[PDB]
Design a protein around this ligand. Structure first.
Ligand SMILES: [Fe+3]
Ligand SMILES: [Fe+3]
Lengths: 373, 373
């Protein structure tokens, strides 16, 4: 059920920050592959001598790509005189994260009412502090606590897009790509031990268990009061588990997958699949045909036969619980290592606004895929 | 003139290797932006537990993108038992290069008759050894010496594409992109002091001075016997020079630009410019119109008025020496730092095969751009 136990007021996912080697190349690949618009920047051209940061947006989804410049450009700065636009940035931590884990998510950012308040209450309730509340241009407050591994939960609060110090991208350079992606649905972490990770995060946030699963993994989902911030966590089950392989290749815990909601998953997948081999993202191998014939059966009130055939053309998976229906598909790993990947999703049902997490997370697609094969 | 002084037999440029944070994302961005085909790989799927390496090709141009996995996957290997396909690879050097310089070229690779012989003679003649000759699957020999900064000159020789241990990419994943790029024309290094860098490299190769220039830089070009391997080197001129800015942002000397020959520079630029804002490469600001009106004058026997207007539509620059004509244009930096960039070029003249370096390197486009502005 839903105790509505949050320890502070949380609004919505706000942004995901990637720590990269070269922000430029990752941002440009992602823009093209996912259909996100180049919308803001913080770098040498805006007077940032510390880090290069590029923001891509699609609907309300915000992806930020950051890399460190040579320390030598800002060696004379101190925290009080910094030209960095994200005060929590550290060359050393960034290089260290990237060396250890390769390309991946550093920050899962949520918008809250009062970032100073959320930080204070989180730490008071057991959160490990990462970067203290700082007010940027008397307008925005940012703070960070450890989530799992070297991933931080970042709190953002606005007095009245992006951050101060970021410049909006002029239309010539800002081509309006858009393949239908609209918001972040969920962000999932892989950890060695689920129990303690749940205890820790639910401990400092007050997020309640929305779900659990028990072929490879045990998992559980933590959610905010209105269930619009959703944070699933997986552990491996030994006696490889895919979660175990992740941990080995990533050098420990970290973010496993980002699930992006599409307002039209058919159009999103047509557009992404067109570009897979020409700079974009590859997709995991499709289910056999026997999976699609079996879908007539499970979701017949939801999707017509032609709508199911469209799923089969795009390799979309469909799952259905008590209350709603889930369309989903997974990309292959986003970079060199077999670590982070993306999920594209769309939800049918639970209408009122649509209830966060309608249809679950696809845990029925486990048995159903291996039944078809 | 041309003394044909090479100390060993050199054939052609063979490949350029980029050291990246995530090879996958850079390779996919480059493939799409430059129209190169994904043609070979060495990674976890081929049993390489040490590095991820992806090869893109367009005509004879070969771009290789490499990143290190977690050291933990191969911690039990020793050099004699390695699963790496490029024996010279080192996790530590790779991470160190990348931390220090960001995304950039590690190796300028040339095909020679005998790589063991070229290495021996180079070192005997003052080259600083980087990795000794190793024979791969009794079929290919690879060796490396220092070129400038942390860039190496790599020698490759074949008994009878790519390397052993690399697998060819299956056609489904190998989309046949092609925007007209066909081979590497030249590879340019930025160094603090030109004199000593020339002395060193000409010292160990026997390459002769093809050229020199003397607004910002002093430069000189070294070339092989048949002038098909061309290696220009720049130094800054103080009292910023763009070469100086490079050095600061790159943390010292390294590769400045790669010049890619196109069999149709108009088509290449149409295709690249279409994709700049959708995952591809941005281009430096175009010359004013006054530059194009002035081209009627300088190159009237080479290009018609409509051919010149096509140059103006694409922002192409044209330069012309004693013997030939050069069409060229420069991309903006390829990654986060204001360091490495790409040049697209096509040459008219010097026909026999076309003479290496026909038309020079565009040093006339210096005064001519600032005359138009
Ligand atoms: Fe998911
Ligand atoms: Fe050049």
């Amino acid at each position: 059920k839903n105790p509505k136990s949050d320890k502070f007021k949380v609004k919505r996912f706000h942004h995901i920050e990637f720590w990269c080697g070269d922000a430029t190349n990752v941002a440009r690949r992602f823009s093209w592959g996912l259909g996100m618009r180049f919308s803001a920047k913080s770098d040498l051209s805006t007077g940032n001598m510390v880090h290069a940061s590029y923001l891509l947006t699609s609907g309300d989804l915000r992806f930020l790509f950051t890399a460190p410049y040579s320390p030598s450009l800002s060696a004379g700065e101190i925290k009080p005189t910094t030209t960095a636009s994200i005060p929590s940035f550290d060359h050393g931590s960034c290089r260290s994260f990237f060396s250890s884990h390769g390309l991946g998510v550093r920050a899962v950012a949520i918008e809250v009412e009062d970032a100073e308040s959320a930080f204070s209450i989180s730490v008071a309730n057991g959160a490990i502090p990462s970067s203290p509340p700082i007010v940027l241009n008397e307008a925005v407050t940012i703070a960070e606590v450890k989530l799992y591994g070297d991933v931080v939960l970042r709190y953002v609060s606005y007095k009245a897009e992006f951050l101060p110090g970021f410049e909006r991208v002029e239309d010539a350079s800002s081509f309006p790509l858009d393949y239908g992606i609209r918001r972040l649905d969920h962000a999932v972490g892989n950890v060695p031990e689920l129990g303690p990770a749940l205890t820790y995060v639910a401990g400092f946030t007050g997020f309640h268990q929305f779900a659990e699963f028990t072929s490879g993994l045990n998992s559980a989902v933590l959610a905010s009061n209105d269930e619009m911030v959703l944070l699933p966590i997986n552990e491996p089950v030994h006696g490889k588990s895919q979660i175990q392989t992740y941990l080995e290749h990533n050098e420990g815990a970290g973010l496993q997958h980002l699930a992006l909601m599409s307002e039209d998953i058919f159009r999103t997948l047509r557009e992404m699949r067109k570009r897979s081999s020409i700079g974009g993202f590859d997709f995991m191998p499709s289910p056999p045909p026997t999976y699609y014939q079996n879908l007539k059966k499970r979701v017949g009130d939801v999707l017509s036969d032609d709508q199911i055939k469209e799923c089969e053309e795009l390799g979309i998976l469909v799952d259905r619980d008590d209350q709603g229906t889930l369309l989903q598909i997974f990309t292959k790993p986003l970079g060199d290592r077999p670590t982070i990947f993306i999920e594209i999703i769309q939800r049918v049902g639970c209408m009122m606004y649509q209830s966060g997490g309608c249809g679950g997370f696809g845990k029925g697609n486990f048995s159903e895929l291996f039944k078809s094969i």
